[PDB]
Amino acid sequence: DSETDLEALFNAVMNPKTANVPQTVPMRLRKLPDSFFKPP
Amino acid sequence: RSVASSKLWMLEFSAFLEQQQDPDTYNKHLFVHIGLEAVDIRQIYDKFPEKKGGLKDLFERGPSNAFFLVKFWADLNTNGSSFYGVSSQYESPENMIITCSTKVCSFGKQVVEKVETEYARYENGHYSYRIHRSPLCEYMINFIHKLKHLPEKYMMNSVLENFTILQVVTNRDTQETLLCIAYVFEVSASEHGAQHHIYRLVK
Numbered sequence: 001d002s003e004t005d006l007e008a009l010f011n012a013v014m015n016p017k018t019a020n021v022p023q024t025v026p027m028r029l030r031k032l033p034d035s036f037f038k039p040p
Numbered sequence: 041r042s043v044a045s046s047k048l049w050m051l052e053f054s055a056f057l058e059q060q061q062d063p064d065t066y067n068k069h070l071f072v073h074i075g076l077e078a079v080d081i082r083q084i085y086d087k088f089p090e091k092k093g094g095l096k097d098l099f100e101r102g103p104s105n106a107f108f109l110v111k112f113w114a115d116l117n118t119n120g121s122s123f124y125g126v127s128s129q130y131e132s133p134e135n136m137i138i139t140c141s142t143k144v145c146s147f148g149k150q151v152v153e154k155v156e157t158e159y160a161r162y163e164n165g166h167y168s169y170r171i172h173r174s175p176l177c178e179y180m181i182n183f184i185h186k187l188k189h190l191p192e193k194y195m196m197n198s199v200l201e202n203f204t205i206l207q208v209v210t211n212r213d214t215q216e217t218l219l220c221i222a223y224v225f226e227v228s229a230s231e232h233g234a235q236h237h238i239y240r241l242v243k
């Protein structure tokens with residue numbers, strides 16, 4: 001099982017070797033408008 | 041009027057850090073501010089609470105013209121004398137008692153909720169509602185602290201991929217959804233600071 005708490009959240013990114021958070025589809029790989037990643 | 045259903049319009053929204061330099065001197069930094077393309081809501085359901093009263097349940101109950109997705113690029117370029125706050129303003133042709141429920145979510149799970157009741161002020165034939173300098177919760181303050189203390193900007197966005205906010209504005213008596221706004225975040229890289237795109241959420 002994975003954890004979903006504040007330290008776990010930042011730990012997953014700071015020290016990816018010890019990551020234990022849910023895995024997800026990156027927003028860039030979803031069916032979203034082009035403007036979603038191009039700021040004005 | 042972008043963020044507007046038939047019954048309510050959000051004119052203003054901002055999250056800020058105000059620092060008191062001395063009793064007469066205040067420096068305010070805006071993290072995000074507001075003051076339409078369509079998005080398939082099914083693409084974001086995983087990022088928000090599910091089950092009864094959740095985004096899907098709310099959207100299915102309608103009306104569909106009350107549902108919005110805001111993409112924020114947040115400005116995090118800022119330094120016991122600090123106030124983290126949020127302000128927002130709404131207008132309506134109707135005199136309602138409204139409830140504003142703000143949920144902070146991590147990987148689609150609710151972590152904290154703030155609930156606020158707002159009464160109308162007559163203003164020019166219509167009615168205004170203002171949430172003025174609502175204190176930002178400690179979780180949000182702490183989250184911002186941790187964000188800024190990450191080595192690299194790419195890390196901030198990686199954290200933010202799974203951090204969302206759901207705001208539901210309801211008529212307290214009738215429970216009609218007046219406005220439902222889903223908020224998604226990246227870090228601003230721009231020379232013009234905070235930016236945003238507003239989308240209509242569709243089935």
Ligand SMILES: *C(=O)CCCCCCCCCCCCC
Pocket residue numbers: 055071072114126142143144152153154175176177178180184205225
């Ligand atoms: C706690 O009391 C309420 C939860 C926060 C209210 C939503 C305000 C939006 C915060 C955006 C800050 C920018 C950091 C990415």
